[PDB]
Amino acid sequence: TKVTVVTGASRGLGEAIVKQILARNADAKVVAVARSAENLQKLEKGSEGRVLAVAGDVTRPETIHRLIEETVAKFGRIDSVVVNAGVLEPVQHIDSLDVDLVRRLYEVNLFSVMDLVRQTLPYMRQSKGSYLFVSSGASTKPYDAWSAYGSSKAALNYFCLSLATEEPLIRALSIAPGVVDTDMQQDIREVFGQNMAPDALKRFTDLHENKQLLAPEVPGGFYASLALRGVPENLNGRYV
């Protein structure tokens, strides 16, 4: 039985990754982490004993300590960690950018990831496990008003390369999922887009209106397969 931790499992891509893991292997176990306790408890209930819900904010080290304690007690091992929790706000031009909101975005998208990797590494070394990071095309392309988010995914890509280089017993891969039909894209269209140049926002509303947003299960099946089968050595540390 392989045990995967998925952060951000209460909705969107991360929820789809959990479901795809359970669909693709009958023995696999998943530890689902996010703040929304009611959603996670429903995931646990629907998954026939194969999901352990751990509710909490990943930016608190108490969450991460409890996550590892409970995973080890219930399943005894960690084989894969899917780093999917993330936030997009603040979507603001640099001339208007609220640095306190930037600090919060980095807590979620990067500093909590450093803490999660540090605390899981002893178990992941034993299992030769794979760390999977959810990145974005914004990590290399400068979307208007997204300097905070895009810079944090650039930092995340580098952190994945650094991890693979320092820890040869594990594998690490940073994967952008394309554009995915989730609340984060809905937020772009209906909330954040008023801070974006009209032409820049029109790219995302066009994708929506043309029915080109991916169902989360589609990129989610690729993370699930990587979580179950491992990262291929020729892509270790890379961004794809």
Ligand SMILES: NC(=O)c1ccc[n+]([C@@H]2O[C@H](COP(=O)([O-])OP(=O)(O)OC[C@H]3O[C@@H](n4cnc5c(N)ncnc54)[C@H](OP(=O)(O)O)[C@@H]3O)[C@@H](O)[C@H]2O)c1
């Ligand atoms: N087109 C796209 O949608 C797209 C494109 C490229 C990359 N991504 C990346 O895909 C990942 C998933 O985002 P999504 O599109 O699935 O949006 P989403 O549906 O809003 O899911 C975001 C997830 O992160 C969790 N989360 C946020 N802050 C958290 C925290 N402090 N502690 C724990 N969990 C937290 C949320 O759960 P709670 O609110 O329950 O905590 C939710 O489960 C993000 O890293 C995003 O950057 C998305």
